[PDB]
Amino acid sequence: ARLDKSNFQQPYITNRTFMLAKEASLADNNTDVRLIGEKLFHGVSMSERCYLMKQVLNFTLEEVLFPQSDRFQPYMQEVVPFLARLSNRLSHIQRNVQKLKDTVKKLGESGEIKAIGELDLLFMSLRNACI
Amino acid sequence: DPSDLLQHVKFQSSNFENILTWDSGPEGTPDTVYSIEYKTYGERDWVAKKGCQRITRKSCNLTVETGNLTELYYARVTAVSAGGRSATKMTDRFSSLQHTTLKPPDVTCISKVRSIQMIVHPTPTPIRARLTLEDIFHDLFYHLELQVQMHLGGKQREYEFFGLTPDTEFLGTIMILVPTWAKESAPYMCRVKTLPDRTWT
């Protein structure tokens, strides 16, 4: 449904999140495929966006950040618990999320790296949708 | 060996004016020209920037080419030396919303006898639809401080600090904040004096 504005008003953790995405994007050589933007919200109302980003967030935690928990330290170990708290707070949509899952899968391990590199986009979409 | 011909290939971005910049590497060489291309993250085709082909200058203004606030971008620079040695190097992924620096706001500081009025002017940008910072960042607000320390803040444009001694000098500082993007401008500062109080008996 909703996330409080105070979750997004903390420069240290916002910056670490951006820093995590930056580091992963450095390992992402695929400039041709963007995961989060655009298509993801096609057919979804503004009021449904927060719930969509919950699903995307929980996918990313469980299938992306988990397998890659060793990478991109020390940012990973600080940022994941933050994103996990946001998930705990939130505790056709399926169609759009499945496409993102498919794309990550098609790209292989590089798709998981791509998703981590797009955490800036996930985080700011979460912010826009949920506040 | 690209790093030997090219280094620090990066966008410098302020209030959404986005200039690609680079320097030459250690390995040479005075006989070198550069050619710039750009692309949108998530698209396939690179585009040559007209006016930045085989240049000797080390920057290229890509403001409009990177002015869609919903996209992210890359640029690349290809160096070619007169001996035929060549290198290409790409920027990191560019996100104007995240990466652009906010300039200090233009502010009007007006003196009264027992107050200072401050008017923050909206910041125009090169973003075309021209949008201001205020149009772009919905949670933008101003932080104002008057050293005498009084503080005021909000989304509104004009503020007045009351209760000041007449004929006295103060220093005001005004900064833009966008808490959600962890963004802050350097402050604009004004040193002004309250007007004299001519009151007679």
Curated annotation (Swiss-Prot), chain A:
Compartment annotation: Secreted
Disulfide bonds: C50-C130
Gene Ontology terms, MF aspect: cytokine activity; interleukin-22 receptor binding
Entry GO CC: extracellular region; extracellular space
Domain of life: Eukaryota
Annotated GO biological process: acute-phase response; inflammatory response; negative regulation of inflammatory response; response to glucocorticoid
Glycan attachment positions: N15, N29, N58
Keywords attached to this entry: Cytokine, Disulfide bond, Glycoprotein, Secreted, Signal
Keyword Glycoprotein: yes
Function: Cytokine that plays a critical role in modulating tissue responses during inflammation. Plays an essential role in the regeneration of epithelial cells to maintain barrier function after injury and for the prevention of further tissue damage. Unlike most of the cytokines, has no effect on immune cells. Signals through a heterodimeric receptor composed of two subunits, the specific receptor IL22RA1 which is present on non-immune cells in many organs and the shared subunit IL10RB.
Family: Belongs to the IL-10 family.
The name this protein goes by in its record: Interleukin-22
Curated annotation (Swiss-Prot), chain B:
S-S pairs: C52-C60, C109-C190
UniProt PTM: Ubiquitinated.
Stimuli inducing this protein: By IFNG/IFN-gamma in keratinocytes.
Tissue and organ expression note: Expressed in colon, liver, lung, pancreas and kidney. No expression in immune cells such as monocytes, T-cells, and NK-cells. Expressed in keratinocytes of normal skin as well as in psoriatic skin lesion. Detected in normal blood brain barrier endothelial cells as well as in multiple sclerosis lesions; Strongly expressed on central nervous system vessels within infiltrated multiple sclerosis lesions. Overexpressed in synovial fluid cells from rheumatoid arthritis and spondyloarthropathy patients.
Cellular location(s): Cell membrane
Residues carrying covalently attached carbohydrate according to the record: N61
Residue numbers on the Extracellular membrane side: 1-201
Domain Fibronectin type-III: 1-105, 122-194
Family stated for the protein in its record: Belongs to the type II cytokine receptor family.
Protein purpose: Component of the receptor for IL20, IL22 and IL24. Component of IL22 receptor formed by IL22RA1 and IL10RB enabling IL22 signaling via JAK/STAT pathways. IL22 also induces activation of MAPK1/MAPK3 and Akt kinases pathways. Component of one of the receptor for IL20 and IL24 formed by IL22RA1 and IL20RB also signaling through STATs activation. Mediates IL24 antiangiogenic activity as well as IL24 inhibitory effect on endothelial cell tube formation and differentiation.
Further remark: Failure of medical and surgical therapy in Chronic rhinosinusitis with nasal polyps is associated with decreased expression of IL22RA1.
Subunit architecture: Heterodimer with IL10RB and with IL20RB. IL22 binding to heterodimer is greater than binding to IL22RA1 alone. Interacts with FBXW12; the interaction promotes ubiquitination of IL22RA1.
Protein name: Interleukin-22 receptor subunit alpha-1
Species name: Homo sapiens
Record lineage: Eukaryota, Metazoa, Chordata, Craniata, Vertebrata
Span within the parent record: 20 to 228 of 574
